[PDB]
């Protein structure tokens, strides 16, 4: 099975150039009768095709973006790339790479897709989060991941070994212009004294990682 | 360009029922070159149907596509809770390639009251001048819920933000987090912090509280 | 109605030419069966960006000076099943629209 993986910055300043790369594994990006596309999704909005490049080099673009967009392939590295110049906040979106084929008749559906990577276009500086406990007293506990920019953060519990009863909420944008989110987990009230619960917070844009052990507050 | 208009914008149906999703095009789409995608929360879109009616490999028989000209449908029979998603159509009969704006499909379930929890601000946060108080509503249905913060019986307004998870793909419930933000100075002037929750599954509102400085 | 003809067992010739306005540097070219579609070619018969895996054994060849814009197609040892429309398509970099030629091939029995 083909697998696609986006890479590149999560934060770009207005008027600068957004560059992303898609690395293809499990198959050759030069195989006959395949095409390779970039599609983006602004937060809370629908999908917009940016452009595609065929195995044979033919490139096609969304007309409104053509003056700013370059898609290219590096067959040596099995990668294809997107450059979008002169970005503004309109270009904040999750960017996906995707592929389609092998086609007989022309087609241009996409499957599989990459995982998507969020790019925020902003002049604001990156800021890593502070992590605070949501302490218990079934029982619930959690971590409050406050005051970071840009999105996203990821949160796991016990290095991914605790997933039952976990809820990681969408972040909210505060009036300060920084994000905050919570992650919670429900556990047995009789377990609070014995068992260890650690939330693992990763904010890649600031290279900030935090491991926070959450316990009942001592009194 | 060909503009695709999906209807309805939102759909809420019980498991085992049939969902009918419409995609309508501003001009005729050449050769039934219309595809449908399922997008689950946090995931890339997944191709369901191409060429209006051909099922993608690995897609269950309960997904069907049909239509032609300007009117296309996606049909999902025998709905399952894991079918919660936003569904998108796509045309590729002309350039630019375009997509509809999506239909959000919620899968109904029986009423489930939230479990409610309140969390005081941590001492570590208080030292930097701000207090966040968090109320959690866990695993409820339907999505409509009311959180009212009270501080020594004063109803708080304008100083909270909330967010709600996507529908759980197995139990079809939602959860909600509300954060009340106060200055450390205001937090330390008051004693009783309370979250009152109203929801269809609660016969009367449920209140969870703490007293500042007590355990 | 322009049709190109070959007789069964002969080699067919489908002319296709473009202005090599990007000098020295490679230009996407495709040929396929069927009229030129929205993008690139349907039912691709040959590649020009690199040699195919079975290059030596294929019946489809570009025997002209493709460097100078001659991307005419040879179809070797034709059969009646080779009759139909063929698409020749060229994308000179930056062009607003590809140049697209639909060529009708009629094979006649021997």
Author numbering:
A (entry chain H): 1 to 137, 145 to 226
B (entry chain L): 1 to 215
C (entry chain T): 2 to 111
Give the article text.
To this end, we engineered 2 anti- (a) Tim-3 monoclonal antibodies (mAbs) that bind (aTim-3.18) or do not bind (aTim-3.22) the PS binding site. Through these structural alignments, we inferred the PS binding pocket in hTim-3. The location of the PS binding pocket is conserved among the TIM members in humans and mice. Specifically, the heavy chain CDR2 of aTim-3.18 occupied the PS binding pocket. These findings show that Tim-3 blockade acted on Tim-3+ APCs but not CD8+ T cells to impede trogocytosis in a PS-dependent fashion. Collectively, our findings show that aTim-3 mAbs act on Tim-3+ APCs in a PS-dependent fashion to disrupt the trogocytosis of activated TA-specific CD8+ T cells and PD-1+Tim-3+ CD8+ TILs in MM.
Tim-3 is upregulated by multiple cell subsets in the TME, including CD8+ and CD4+ T cells, CD4+ regulatory T cells, and antigen-presenting cells (APCs). Here, we show that human programmed cell death 1–positive (PD-1+) Tim-3+CD8+ tumor-infiltrating lymphocytes (TILs) upregulate phosphatidylserine (PS), a receptor for Tim-3, and acquire cell surface myeloid markers from antigen-presenting cells (APCs) through transfer of membrane fragments called trogocytosis. Tim-3 acts on APCs in a PS-mediated fashion to induce T cell trogocytosis.
